[PDB]
C-alpha cells in the first residue's frame, strides 16, 4: 500500500522554476536554469539538428529496435570526440560505447554496472558537484564520498585539499571527475593538475569515472577533452559518461553515452556485455531519435561544420556574458572583485552570494538563483545585465 | 578492475537474430522477432507517426527538458486509454502517469519505486512470461515468484493451477498481470476469470502491476482494457506499465508509461513524488520525441482516426495469419490439431514444438523460432506460409 508513503523533498533546482513561473513581477530573471538561453532568452533547437531531423524524417524506414548499445555510428563518433582520432584506445578496440538516455542514464548504468560486477562500494564525488550525482550513485547502492574542491575564499581549485582528501580513498574506489566546466564551481584543473592528478590516480589505483557533459563550452571540443585524454593515456581502464544534451541542444531527447575502456579488446568486450545486461534490465534499448540526429550531424562534413559553428557561438555568448556581468557590476558600484568569474568556464559559477542574499534578491527583486549562490551565466542578456547587477549590488 | 568480469550469457531472444542474419540459406524465415512485420516482411513506421513527426518538425521551438513525468498531454491520454473516459480514477484524480523510456522503463521504475518505498519483496510473474521481467525486478532487488499459467497439454489458461499457486502469495506481494496478448502464451483470462481473479485479488491483498504492451492487438483498444479496468474498479491502488512500442510502431523511440493509482488525490500525489525521485535518479527526464508523436496523434481527431485504422489493420493481419498457419498445416498433412492457435491473441503463441524440433527446423530448414517453441505469427506472410508449414510438418 501507498497511503503511508512520505512525500519526497523539492529538487535543489526545480523548485525555483515554479516560484519563478508564478512571480507576479514580470521584470524577473532566472539564473538557476542549468539550460542555455540565447540573446533572446530562448532555448532554440540547433539549425543543424533541424536539418538533421528533416533528413531523418525523409529517410527513416522503420522504428525497429536499436541494439542495447544503440546506433554504431553514434558510438564510434562519441569515441572519436572523447579520445580523439588516432587514439590507440580506438585503434586497439579497448573502448566500447553504449547509447544511453542522457548523461544521467550513462551515470546510472555505469553505476548499476559497477555496483553489480565489481567490489566498488564508494564513489568520490567532489565538493560541490551536480546534486543528482549522489542520488544516482546511492540508487545503485554505492556510497558517495566527498573530496574537497572549491576554495570559498579565493574562488578556485584547492588542489592541495583535493589530493589531500583523495588519499583517504582506497585503491578500488571510483573517483568521479568532471571533464570540463565543473558544475557548479565552473573551476577546472589545468592540463598540469590533470596530468599529476592522473599519475597520482594510477599510483593509488582509482577507477576514474568522467562526467563529460559540457564538452565544447570551455575552450572547444578538442581542448575540453585533453584532461580525459590525459587520464586515458595513463589508465588501462576507465568509464566516461558523456551528455549531448547541452552542446547539441538536444536536452529532452535524452542523448548521451557510457563509454567503457579496459586493458584490451577481449576484456572490454567481456565487461561491456555485462554493461549491456544492466541496460536491458533498465530500459532495454535507447531512444533512437536524439542519437540519430547526433550521428548524422557528426558524420556529415557539411552539417557538422554548422553544428561546430553553432556551438562556438554558444560558447562565445556565455564566454562574454561573464565579462558583461563582471564589468557592469564595477560600474553599478560594487565593492568586491568579481574577476574570478571571467576565469571560470561553462554555464555555471558561484556568484559568492549568501543563501540569505540570494533569498532577498528573489524576494525583493525577482532574481532567481540556486540556494548555493550558483548563477547561470547563460541566462544573462545585455538587456537584463543592467538591472541584474543593479539588484545584486543593492544586496551586497 | 574489469579483467576478471565473467561475460554475460546470450539473451533468450537476441541470439537468434545473429544466426539468422548469417544463415547462408536466403530461403530462411524468422519467427522469434517479437516485432511486427507487414505482408512485405518489413516493420514500417505508421503513416500517422510520419505525419505526426513532420508536424513536430515544423512546430517544435525548443528541446528544453520535460518534467520528470514527461509531457502532460501524453499522461492524460494514456490515462484515458487505460481506464476509459468517465473513469472515476481520472475524475477523482487518483492516478498519476509518468512518461518512461518504454514499457521496460515503466517496469523498472515501478520496481525501483516499490523496492525503495514499500515492503514489497516478491513479485509474482507468471509461467511463462516475458523473460526480461525477472531481470528487471531482480535488478530492483525484488524476488520473482512464479504462478502457474499455461496448460502445456490443452494449450490454455489453467485457471485452477493459477489461483492455486497465487494463494502461496502473502498479502503484500505484487502480482504481475498481462493486460492482453499474454507474451508468450497468447492465452488470456476471460472477462469472467479477470473479475474473479480481481475480487480474489482484493481479498488476499495483492498489489497488481499490469504490464500493458499490446493494447489493441487482441480485440481492440477498448476491449483489451476491460481486464485492467475490472481490477481498477475493485482496487484502490495499483500500478500499470504501458508500452506504445507495438501499437504505434514506435519501438526504438522508447515510448511507454508507468501509471500509479492510489486511494485518493492526496495519497497518489504523495507517492508519485517518490516515483518521480526514482526517475530523476535513473535518467532524469524522458525522451520527448516518441511521446510528442503519441500525444499529438491521440489528441488529433483526424490523425488518431488514421492511427486507429492502421492498428486495426495490424491486428487483422496477425488475426488472419493464425488461420493461414493453422489450415495450411492441415493441408500440408499435419497430424495434430493446431486449432488452439486461432483462439490465441497478440503476436505470439507457443507452436508446441520441442526445443529439439525448433532446432532441427532451424538447422535443417532455416526457420527460426524461440527455444520455447514460441512463434511470432506476425512474421508469417502468405508467401512464406507455404514452405513454413511444410518444414514444420516434416519435423512433427
Ligand atoms: C555535470 C553534469 N552531469 C550530468 C548531467 C546530465 O545531463 P543529461 O540531462 O543529459 O543527463 C548534467 C546536467 N547538466 C551535469 O551538469
Ligand atoms: C509483455 C511485455 N512487456 C513489456 C515489453 C516491453 O516493450 P518496450 O520495448 O516498450 O519496453 C514487452 C516487449 N514486447 C513485452 O512483451
Ligand atoms: O541545472 C543543473 O545543473 C541541473 C540540470 C539537471 C537536469 O536537467 O537533469
Ligand atoms: O520478442 C519479445 O517478446 C521480446 C522483445 C523485448 C524487447 O524488444 O525489448
Q: Residue B5: list chain A partners with CB under 8 A.
A: 117-118, 267, 270-271, 274
Residues in chain A: 396
Q: Exposed/middle/buried for B24, CB within 10 Å: 0-12, 13-18, 19+? A: exposed
Shortest CA distance to B102 belongs to which of B254, B242, B214, B249?
A: B254
Q: Which ligand lies nearest to the CA atom of residue A248 in the structure? A: 1
Shortest CA distance to A358 belongs to which of A70, A125, A21, A15?
A: A15
CATH architecture, domain B11-44+316-396: Alpha-Beta Complex (3.90)
Place of cell 533546482: A13
A28, A37, A51, A246: which is the annotated catalytic residue? A246
**Measured distance CA(B70)–CA(B339) in Å, rounded:** 44
What is the interface size between A and B, counted as CB pairs within 8 Å?
216
Are A11-44+316-396 and A45-315 the same fold in CATH? Answer: no
Atom from ligand 2 closest to the CA of residue B182: 1
Is B274 part of the contact surface with chain A (CB cutoff 8 Å)? yes
- Phi, psi for residue A33 in degrees, rounded to 5: -90, -35
**Measured distance CA(B48)–CA(B249) in Å, rounded:** 10
> Which of B33, B78, B104, B376 to probe ligand 2 with, by most ligand atoms within 8 A of CB?
B104
User: Which residues, 6 or more positions from B341, have their beta carbon under 8 angstroms from its beta carbon?
Assistant: B322, B325, B326, B349, B377
Going by the annotation, the residues of the binding site of B are: 34, 130, 183, 374
Active site residue A236: no
* Cell triple for A151: 576554495
> Cα dist. B182→A175, A251, B156, B228, B324 in Å?
45, 36, 11, 13, 21
Distance between Cα B104 and ligand 2 center (Å)? 6
**Measured distance CA(A241)–CA(A100) in Å, rounded:** 9
Cβ atoms of A241 and B52 closer than 8 Å: no
Asked if the Cβ–Cβ distance from A278 to B35 is below 8 Å, we say no
Q: How many CA atoms lie within 13 A of B174 on its CB side?
A: 29
Going by the annotation, the residues of the binding site of B for L-aspartate are: 34, 130, 183, 374
The SS3 call for residue A42 is coil
* Cell triple for B3: 579483467
A34 lines ligand 1 (CB under 6 A): yes
* Cell triple for B356: 529439439
Every domain of chain B and the residues it spans? 11-44+316-396, 45-315
Asked if the Cβ–Cβ distance from B284 to A249 is below 8 Å, we say no
- Closest approach of chain B CAs to the CA of A69, in angstroms? 12
Asked if the Cβ–Cβ distance from A8 to B287 is below 8 Å, we say no
**What residue in B sits closest to A260 (Cα-Cα)?**
B2
* Cell triple for A364: 525583493
- Closest approach of chain B CAs to the CA of A251, in angstroms? 5
- Closest approach of chain A CAs to the CA of B57, in angstroms? 7
**Measured distance CA(B117)–CA(A2) in Å, rounded:** 8
Q: Residue A6: list chain B partners with CB under 8 A.
A: 270, 274
What is the pairing mode between strands A255-261 and B29-30? unpaired
Place of cell 526514482: B278
- Phi, psi for residue B348 in degrees, rounded to 5: -110, 155
Asked if the Cβ–Cβ distance from A289 to B57 is below 8 Å, we say no
- Ligand 3, pocket residues at CB < 6 Å: A 13, 34, 130, 183; B 65, 284
Is A277 part of the contact surface with chain B (CB cutoff 8 Å)? yes
**Measured distance CA(B177)–CA(B124) in Å, rounded:** 9
Number of H helices, E strands in chain A: 15, 11
Cis peptide before A128, with omega less than 30 degrees from 0? yes
Q: Point out the residues of B that are catalytic.
A: 130, 211, 246
> Cα dist. B296→B77, B216, B221, B289, B304 in Å?
10, 19, 18, 11, 8
Cα Rg of chain A (Å, integer): 21
Cβ atoms of B348 and B186 closer than 8 Å: yes
Is B267 part of the contact surface with chain A (CB cutoff 8 Å)? yes
Q: How far, rounded to the nearest angstrom, does the alpha carbon of residue A179 sit from its chain's CA centroid?
A: 8
Strand locations in B27-117, DSSP E?
29-30, 95-101
CATH architecture, domain A45-315: 3-Layer(aba) Sandwich (3.40)
* Cell triple for A187: 573551476
Cis peptide before A261, with omega less than 30 degrees from 0? no
Asked if the Cβ–Cβ distance from A64 to B136 is below 8 Å, we say no
Q: Exposed/middle/buried for B80, CB within 10 Å: 0-12, 13-18, 19+? A: middle
**Measured distance CA(B151)–CA(B158) in Å, rounded:** 5
**What residue in B sits closest to A101 (Cα-Cα)?**
B283
**Measured distance CA(A180)–CA(A213) in Å, rounded:** 8
Taking only residues 57 to 76 of chain B, the set having a beta carbon closer than 8 angstroms to any beta carbon of chain A reads 57, 60-66
Taking only residues 373 to 392 of chain A, the set having a beta carbon closer than 8 angstroms to any beta carbon of chain B reads none
A37, A69, A112, A130: which is the annotated catalytic residue? A130
Interface probe for B, chosen from A130, A170, A287, A307 (most Cβ of B below 10 Å), is A287
- Phi, psi for residue A257 in degrees, rounded to 5: -150, 150
Nearest by CB to residue B251, choosing from A49, A65, A101, is A65
Amino acid at each position: 500500500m501507498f497511503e503511508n508513503i512520505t512525500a519526497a523533498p523539492a529538487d535543489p533546482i526545480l523548485g525555483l522554476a515554479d516560484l519563478f513561473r508564478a512571480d507576479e513581477r514580470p521584470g524577473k530573471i532566472n539564473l538557476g536554469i542549468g539550460v542555455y538561453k540565447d540573446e533572446t532568452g530562448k532555448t532554440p533547437v540547433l539549425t543543424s539538428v533541424k536539418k538533421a531531423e528533416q533528413y531523418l524524417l525523409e529517410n527513416e524506414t522503420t522504428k525497429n529496435y536499436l541494439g542495447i548499445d544503440g546506433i554504431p555510428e553514434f558510438g564510434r563518433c562519441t569515441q572519436e570526440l572523447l579520445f580523439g582520432k588516432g587514439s590507440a584506445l580506438i585503434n586497439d578496440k579497448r573502448a566500447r560505447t553504449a547509447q544511453t538516455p542522457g548523461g544521467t542514464g550513462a551515470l546510472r548504468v555505469a553505476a548499476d554496472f559497477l555496483a553489480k560486477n565489481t567490489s566498488v562500494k564508494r564513489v568520490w564525488v567532489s565538493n560541490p558537484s551536480w546534486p543528482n550525482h549522489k542520488s544516482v550513485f546511492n540508487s545503485a547502492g554505492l556510497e558517495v564520498r566527498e573530496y574537497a574542491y572549491y576554495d570559498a575564499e579565493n574562488h578556485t581549485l584547492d588542489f592541495d585539499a583535493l589530493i589531500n582528501s583523495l588519499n583517504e580513498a582506497q585503491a578500488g574506489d571510483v573517483v568521479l571527475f568532471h571533464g570540463c566546466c565543473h558544475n557548479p564551481t565552473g573551476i577546472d584543473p589545468t592540463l598540469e593538475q590533470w596530468q599529476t592528478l592522473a599519475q597520482l590516480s594510477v599510483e593509488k589505483g582509482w577507477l576514474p569515472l568522467f562526467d563529460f557533459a559540457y564538452q565544447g563550452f570551455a575552450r572547444g571540443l578538442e581542448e575540453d577533452a585533453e584532461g580525459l585524454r590525459a587520464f586515458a593515456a595513463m589508465h588501462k581502464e576507465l568509464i566516461v559518461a558523456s551528455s549531448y544534451s547541452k552542446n547539441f541542444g538536444l536536452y529532452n531527447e535524452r542523448v548521451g553515452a557510457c563509454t567503457l575502456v579496459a586493458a584490451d579488446s577481449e576484456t572490454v568486450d567481456r565487461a561491456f556485455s555485462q554493461m549491456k545486461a544492466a541496460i536491458r534490465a533498465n530500459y532495454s534499448n535507447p531512444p533512437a531519435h536524439g542519437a540519430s540526429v547526433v550521428a548524422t550531424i557528426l558524420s556529415n562534413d557539411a552539417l557538422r561544420a554548422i553544428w561546430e559553428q553553432e556551438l562556438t557561438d554558444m560558447r562565445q555568448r556565455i564566454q562574454r556574458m561573464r565579462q558583461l556581468f563582471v564589468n557592469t557590476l564595477q560600474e553599478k558600484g560594487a565593492n568586491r572583485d568579481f574577476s574570478f568569474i571571467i576565469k571560470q568556464n561553462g554555464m555555471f559559477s558561484f556568484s559568492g552570494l549568501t543563501k540569505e542574499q540570494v533569498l532577498r534578491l528573489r524576494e525583493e527583486f525577482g532574481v532567481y538563483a540556486v540556494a548555493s549562490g550558483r548563477v547561470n551565466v547563460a541566462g544573462m542578456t545585455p538587456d537584463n545585465m543592467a538591472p541584474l547587477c543593479e539588484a545584486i549590488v543593492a544586496v551586497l
